[PDB]
Design a binder for this molecule. Sequence first.
Ligand code: HEM
Ligand SMILES: *[C@@H]1O[C@H](CO)[C@@H](O)[C@H](O)[C@H]1NC(C)=O
Ligand SMILES: *[C@@H]1O[C@H](CO)[C@@H](O)[C@H](O)[C@@H]1O
Ligand SMILES: *[C@H]1O[C@H](CO)[C@@H](O)[C@H](O)[C@@H]1O
Ligand SMILES: [Ca+2]
Ligand SMILES: [Ca+2]
Length: 339
Amino acid sequence: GGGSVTCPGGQSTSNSQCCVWFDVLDDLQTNFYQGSKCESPVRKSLRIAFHDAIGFSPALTAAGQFGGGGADGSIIAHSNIELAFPANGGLTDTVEALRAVGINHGVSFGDLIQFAAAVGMSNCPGSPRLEFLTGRSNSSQPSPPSLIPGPGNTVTAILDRFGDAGFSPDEVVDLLAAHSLASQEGLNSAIFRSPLDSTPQVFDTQFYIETLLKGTTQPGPSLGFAEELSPFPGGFRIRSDALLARDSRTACRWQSMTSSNEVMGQRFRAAMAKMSVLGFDRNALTDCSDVIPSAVSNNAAPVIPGGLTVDDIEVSCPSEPFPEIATASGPLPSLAPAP
Ligand code: HEM
Ligand SMILES: *[C@@H]1O[C@H](CO)[C@@H](O)[C@H](O)[C@H]1NC(C)=O
Ligand SMILES: *[C@@H]1O[C@H](CO)[C@@H](O)[C@H](O)[C@@H]1O
Ligand SMILES: *[C@H]1O[C@H](CO)[C@@H](O)[C@H](O)[C@@H]1O
Ligand SMILES: [Ca+2]
Ligand SMILES: [Ca+2]
């Protein structure tokens, strides 16, 4: 009930509580995203959205311990503690930028983190319009350690961690679609911002396709932590991604994610919707999704690049034949570092 309202700025929204977010939106797009760009800040933001929310463990709670508050913005309010975690390196600068936006505009760290991620993705072509709820308390307790899955973890360990959090193997695969807009800076400092897929600025299925290709080249002088050979020069491949793409428990869902950008988009949206509210009752929050702008549509079709073919794909789903995917001519492409 209530009805649509008009904000002070003339914008139309579903609830009055959404109005303050239009100010944050202008701030982020203007400053943080340096003109609504899809570069490092967007990737850092998405990474932070995950690392804040994932600090939620029903298992710890069942053992009589604090299991973490989930998407409570603890990674910021307790950055001194959480940024010490193995998986939270290279986030400090982004955390400080977000801390200031939240403090000034007066929005909670929890809400802001999920907001920034949704807004950031709208700057990258092909991205779906993520759900955005507001109303998370700004208060939090530091996240317990060892709750973030690591690149060197076995699939069994990764599935267990996510399972505890509330995600099925299929959902973990869906969640990894975020690596379609990713690079690494801390695994191998020798090759700064080496992309995970051939399109670090396009939310597409390229990540799922290329991760299944045979690893043939080494991007840098030496291998970094949890690094595997990749298919293209300049490209990077995380061990956990390589394993998940080929493990019988996740192989078919991963393969199903290669030919359809639309299917990928909603799967990621649904999985993200659940992650963004870990540690909260979504019914206690307010839906402000209409604040999130739409992104440019991706008209490029999925493809096996560089002259490689299905024969270069290490098909891991025994029950389904690899989908029909276009191929290309020209040589093997050299991937430039993500912007
Ligand atoms: C299942 C396990 C997952 C593992 C082991 C994992 C691991 C990693 C690692 C080691 C990096 C490189 C960090 C660096 O050295 O700069 C990375 C990057 C990234 N990850 Fe994941 N990740 C996982 C899931 C996710 C999820 C669920 C999301 C968000 C919805 C996400 C979003 C990102 C983004 C956007 C980057 C790129 C950062 C950049 O370009 O700066 N990841 N991830
Ligand atoms: C949220 O908490 C931080 C300290 O953890 C504080 O600096 C900030 O002003 C708070 N934000 C709001 C909206 O009260
Ligand atoms: C991709 O394109 C190349 C060159 O046309 C073929 O060799 C391959 O079979 C696939 O069609
Ligand atoms: C091919 O060229 C790109 C830059 O255009 C590099 O990033 C890659 O490592 C390889 O030298
Ligand atoms: Ca948290
Ligand atoms: Ca991509």
